[PDB]
């Protein structure tokens, strides 16, 4: 997407979670902005010593290196539950005789 | 919780924010150097001052994480630069005045000039003008006029600026727990926190001294060879056992002797290796020079170059409206955006500089996987060394005839190699004693061993002893030779050249073991051998995250610099200079002076 989602001067729209007190489970979305406490210094949503804002914004410009270029990633989650199946693969019809 | 976990949290967040500002700082610094506009000069200073002050603001929380409680080598080496607070450890007076000293010495260096006594209306600037005249002039008086008058108007003016340059920089080093500012650059090699790989700061004094002794037998034969040729030119001012005048060294400050090759030619009836006229026959342009250079990096086993590198490179200067610096330079920006600023003509040196400038980027793409504070050369000498190791084998007749530049009818023998090795020797051999001389003299003055009155007394005394060079005009303590140097006035490392030659020949020799080449070094060609880039990339990707002795040991297996690759590379010349110097005196004597009769 480097010709689309990146622009001169940087694109701050796309963020990420740099710090968290633990590891997330599969299929877990956490939007919590709570400040990560590195040491014993109290934070309570206030920045300071050992208090750092976890979310960070990717620098995106068209000149970034291939490994650092922004890429649009679409992850397809296929979940088979006890409920009947809904989405099916393509059905390609042929001529009739 | 622990200091190792607390500091790692600060350093992980810092790597993201510092990479954004430093890249934009180098991007604005790139846009101005390549294109001169009034918008880029403001963005270069703004983005440069923001990132410079960004590390000063974050160094308050970084200095609270000592390196004794951290067992991680990466975390300690990242905080090592953040522990130094820059202008903060200095007092408000000493910090603000220091910036004035470094800026004033650069203004005098850039705006300085020496007028022509024969043409009062013609006054030539230092760069290129005064460096060009001292380059091509064979005359005794024409060189001495611009050589002596410079240090009178400039060198004498830079003496009080050099006085503050010694004092104000030592106060910052002593606040950093360093002996002096001479130890500040001895701290560039400093290694602590690893068992057995630690590097003593005071060991560097013996390291460069033990190597210079092995350079003597190669330098004594060449210095006596050049002195014997210059003796017939000036028999009164040049003794066979004496020293050569300081203004005849071939350039302004005596850095390179390369322009004296015309008189020193070993054989006038034998050809030498030159691709300048060969590139005219093969018809290669600036776009195809870097194009043919990438194929060499792929064949040797090094990673290729991205399309953004070759497309966005700056190949020339589109006039004065948008002006690009023609001095070859490779700027490291970040985020995988790497570019090279050079004015590309058709010459043999531009092809060797092509692999030289791309060698910086070839090293830059290796450590890009490391954290930002771990993204850098392991020292200041590895930057310029990685570029030359690609150009050493690129000038070999094996690769030149494979790509088509050098004609296959070209005869390769001892007579043709010595002509080419000596032309490169004056650039190589001529730099080592002069560079080992200047930095060693700074270590003594920064320490205080040399009183202010003996600055030039020890300078010219160490000049006759080291490089065997005597002054035509005796200089008192009022003059200062090193203050006019580009590296000293701009606070850059000039010793990187003495270390490069010992680094570049080690990096080249060890790869020839995997490239299956034996004998002299110049006969080794790493092209088409994939094992060269494989063993080299493992060292280049570490950067300074590991001790520079560790990365050096991963290739050559040595923890220090070695002159043995310098000997075998010039071995056809070293054995030839010994034969020609049989009728002369090897070495030099410090008791001869041109003005003392």
UniProtKB/Swiss-Prot annotation, chain A:
Note down the stretches annotated as region Immunodominant HLA epitope recognized by the CD8+.
Answer: 11-19
The impact of changing residue 23 to K is: In strain: Omicron/BA.2.75, Omicron/BQ.1.1, Omicron/XBB.1.5, Omicron/EG.5.1
Cysteines joined through disulfide linkages: 43-51
Q: What outcome is documented for mutating residue 68 to H in this protein?
A: In strain: Omicron/BA.1, Omicron/BA.2, Omicron/BA.2.12.1, Omicron/BA.2.75, Omicron/BA.4, Omicron/BA.5, Omicron/BQ.1.1, Omicron/XBB.1.5, Omicron/EG.5.1
Annotated region described as Disordered, given as residue ranges: 18-53, 82-97
Q: What is the effect of changing residue 47 to A?
A: In strain: Omicron/BA.1, Omicron/BA.2, Omicron/BA.2.12.1, Omicron/BA.2.75, Omicron/BA.4, Omicron/BA.5, Omicron/BQ.1.1, Omicron/XBB.1.5, Omicron/EG.5.1
**Annotated effect of mutating residue 64 to T:** In strain: 19B/501T
The effect of residue 9 to S is: In strain: Omicron/BA.1, Omicron/BA.2.75, Omicron/XBB.1.5, Omicron/EG.5.1
Q: Where is this region: Receptor-binding motif?
A: 1-71
* Effect listed in the UniProt record for changing residue 15 to R: Increased resistance to neutralizing antibodies. Decreases HLA binding to NF9 epitope. Increased binding affinity to human ACE2
Query: What result follows from mutating residue 8 to P?
Result: In strain: Omicron/XBB.1.5, Omicron/EG.5.1
> What is the recorded phenotype of mutating residue 46 to A?
Increased resistance to neutralizing antibodies
The impact of changing residue 40 to N is: In strain: 20A.EU2, Iota/B.1.526, Omicron/BA.1, Omicron/BA.2, Omicron/BA.2.12.1, Omicron/BA.2.75, Omicron/BA.4, Omicron/BA.5, Omicron/BQ.1.1, Omicron/XBB.1.5, Omicron/EG.5.1
Q: Subunit arrangement?
A: Binds to host ACE2. RBD also interacts with the N-linked glycan on 'Asn-90' of ACE2. Cleavage of S generates a polybasic C-terminal sequence on S1 that binds to host Neuropilin-1 (NRP1) and Neuropilin-2 (NRP2) receptors. Interacts with host integrin alpha-5/beta-1 (ITGA5:ITGB1) and with ACE2 in complex with integrin alpha-5/beta-1 (ITGA5:ITGB1). May interact via cytoplasmic c-terminus with M protein. May interact (via N-terminus) with host bilirubin and biliverdin, thereby preventing antibody binding to the SARS-CoV-2 spike NTD via an allosteric mechanism.
Q: What does this protein do?
A: Attaches the virion to the cell membrane by interacting with host receptor, initiating the infection. The major receptor is host ACE2. When S2/S2' has been cleaved, binding to the receptor triggers direct fusion at the cell membrane. When S2/S2' has not been cleaved, binding to the receptor results in internalization of the virus by endocytosis using host TFRC and GRM2 and leading to fusion of the virion membrane with the host endosomal membrane. Alternatively, may use NRP1/NRP2 and integrin as entry receptors.
> Could you identify this protein by its name?
Spike protein S1
Query: What stretch of the whole protein does this chain cover?
Result: 438 to 534 of 1273
Swiss-Prot record, chain B:
Quote the annotated effect of residue 253 to Q.
About 95% loss of angiotensin I cleavage
Reported impact of residue 294 to A: No effect on interaction with SARS-CoV spike glycoprotein
Q: Which domain of life is it from?
A: Eukaryota
Q: What does the UniProt entry list as the effect of changing residue 61 to T?
A: Increases slightly the interaction with RBD domain of SARS-CoV-2 spike protein
Q: What is its EC number?
A: 3.4.17.23, 3.4.17.-
Q: Please tell me where substrate binds in this chain.
A: 255, 327-328, 497
What result is annotated for mutating residue 51 to V?
Increases slightly the interaction with RBD domain of SARS-CoV-2 spike protein
Induction of this protein: by what? Up-regulated in failing heart. Expression is induced by IFNA and IFNG. Exposure to cigarette smoke increases expression in lungs. Expression is decreased in nasal and bronchial epithelium of individuals with allergy after allergen challenge. IL13 stimulation decreases expression in nasal and bronchial epithelium.
Could you say what the effect of mutating residue 375 to K is? Increases very slightly the interaction with RBD domain of SARS-CoV-2 spike protein
Record annotation: effect of changing residue 54 to Y = Increases slightly the interaction with RBD domain of SARS-CoV-2 spike protein
As its record notes, the protein acts as a catalyst of: angiotensin II + H2O = angiotensin-(1-7) + L-phenylalanine; angiotensin I + H2O = angiotensin-(1-9) + L-leucine; bradykinin(1-8) + H2O = bradykinin(1-7) + L-phenylalanine; neurotensin + H2O = neurotensin-(1-12) + L-leucine
Protein's GO biological process? angiotensin maturation; angiotensin-mediated drinking behavior; blood vessel diameter maintenance; entry receptor-mediated virion attachment to host cell; maternal process involved in female pregnancy; membrane fusion; negative regulation of ERK1 and ERK2 cascade; negative regulation of smooth muscle cell proliferation
Q: What UniProt keywords apply to this chain's record, in alphabetical order?
A: Carboxypeptidase, Cell membrane, Cell projection, Chloride, Cytoplasm, Disulfide bond, Glycoprotein, Host cell receptor for virus entry, Host-virus interaction, Hydrolase, Isopeptide bond, Membrane, Metal-binding, Metalloprotease, Phosphoprotein, Protease, Receptor, Secreted, Signal, Transmembrane, Transmembrane helix, Ubl conjugation, Zinc
Q: What is this protein called?
A: Angiotensin-converting enzyme 2
Show which stretch of the intact protein is covered.
19 to 615 of 805
């Amino acid at each position: 997407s480097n010709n689309l989602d990146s622009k001169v001067g940087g694109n701050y729209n796309y963020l990420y979670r740099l710090f968290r007190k633990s590891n997330l489970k599969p299929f877990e979305r956490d939007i919590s902005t709570e400040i990560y406490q590195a040491g014993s210094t109290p934070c309570n949503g206030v920045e300071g010593f050992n208090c750092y804002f976890p979310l960070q914004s990717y620098g995106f410009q068209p000149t970034n290196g291939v490994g650092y270029q922004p890429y649009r990633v679409v992850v397809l989650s296929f979940e088979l539950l006890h409920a009947p199946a809904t989405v099916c693969g393509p059905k390609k019809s042929t001529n009739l005789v | 919780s622990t200091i190792e976990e607390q500091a790692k949290t600060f350093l992980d967040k810092f790597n993201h924010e510092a990479e954004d500002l430093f890249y934009q700082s180098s991007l604005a610094s790139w846009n101005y150097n390549t294109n001169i506009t009034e918008e880029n000069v403001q963005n270069m200073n703004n983005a440069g001052d923001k990132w410079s002050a960004f590390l000063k603001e974050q160094s308050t929380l970084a200095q609270m994480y000592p390196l004794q409680e951290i067992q991680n080598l990466t975390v300690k080496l990242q905080l090592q630069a953040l522990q130094q607070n820059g202008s903060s450890v200095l007092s408000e007076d000493k910090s603000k005045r220091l910036n004035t000293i470094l800026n004033t010495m650069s203004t005098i260096y850039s705006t300085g000039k020496v007028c022509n006594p024969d043409n009062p209306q013609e006054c030539l600037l230092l760069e290129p003008g005064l460096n060009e005249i001292m380059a091509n002039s064979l005359d005794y008086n024409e060189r001495l006029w611009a050589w002596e008058s410079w240090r009178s108007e400039v060198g004498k003016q830079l003496r009080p600026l050099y006085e503050e340059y010694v004092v104000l920089k030592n106060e910052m080093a002593r606040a950093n727990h360093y002996e002096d500012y001479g130890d500040y650059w001895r701290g560039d090699y400093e290694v602590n926190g690893v068992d057995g790989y630690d590097y003593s700061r005071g060991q560097l004094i013996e390291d460069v001294e033990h190597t210079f002794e092995e350079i003597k037998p190669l330098y004594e034969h060449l210095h006596a060879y050049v002195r014997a040729k210059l003796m017939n030119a000036y028999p009164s001012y040049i003794s066979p056992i004496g020293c050569l005048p300081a203004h005849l060294l071939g350039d302004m400050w005596g850095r390179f002797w390369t322009n004296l090759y015309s008189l020193t030619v070993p054989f006038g009836q034998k050809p030498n290796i030159d691709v300048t006229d060969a590139m005219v026959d093969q018809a290669w342009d600036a776009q195809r020079i870097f194009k043919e250079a990438e194929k060499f990096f792929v064949s040797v086993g090094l990673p290729n170059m991205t399309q953004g590198f070759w497309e966005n490179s700056m190949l020339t200067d589109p006039g004065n409206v948008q002006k690009a610096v023609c001095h070859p330079t490779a700027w490291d920006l970040g985020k995988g955006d790497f570019r090279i600023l050079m004015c590309t003509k058709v010459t043999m040196d531009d092809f060797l500089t092509a692999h030289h400038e791309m060698g910086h980027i070839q090293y830059d793409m290796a450590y890009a996987a490391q954290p930002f504070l771990l993204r850098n050369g392991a020292n200041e000498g590895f930057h310029e060394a990685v570029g030359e190791i690609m150009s050493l084998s690129a000038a070999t007749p094996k690769h030149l005839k494979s790509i088509g530049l050098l004609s296959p009818d070209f005869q390769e023998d001892n007579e043709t190699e010595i002509n080419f090795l000596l032309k490169q020797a004056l650039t190589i051999v001529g730099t080592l004693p002069f560079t080992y001389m200047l930095e060693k003299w700074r270590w003594m003055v920064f320490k205080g061993e040399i009183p202010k009155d003996q600055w030039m007394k020890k300078w010219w005394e160490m000049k006759r002893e080291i490089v065997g060079v005597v002054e035509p005009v005796p200089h008192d303590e009022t003059y200062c030779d090193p203050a006019s140097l580009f590296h000293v006035s701009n606070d850059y490392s000039f010793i990187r050249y003495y270390t490069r030659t010992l680094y570049q020949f080690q990096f080249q020799e060890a790869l020839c073991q995997a490239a299956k080449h034996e004998g002299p070094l110049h006969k080794c060609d790493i092209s088409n051998s994939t094992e060269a880039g494989q063993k080299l990339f493992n060292m280049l990707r570490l950067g300074k995250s590991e001790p520079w002795t560790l990365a050096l040991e991963n290739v050559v297996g040595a923890k220090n610099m070695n002159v043995r690759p310098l000997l075998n590379y010039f071995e056809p010349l070293f054995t030839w200079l010994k034969d020609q110097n049989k009728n002369s005196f090897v070495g030099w004597s410090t008791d001869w002076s041109p003005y003392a009769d």
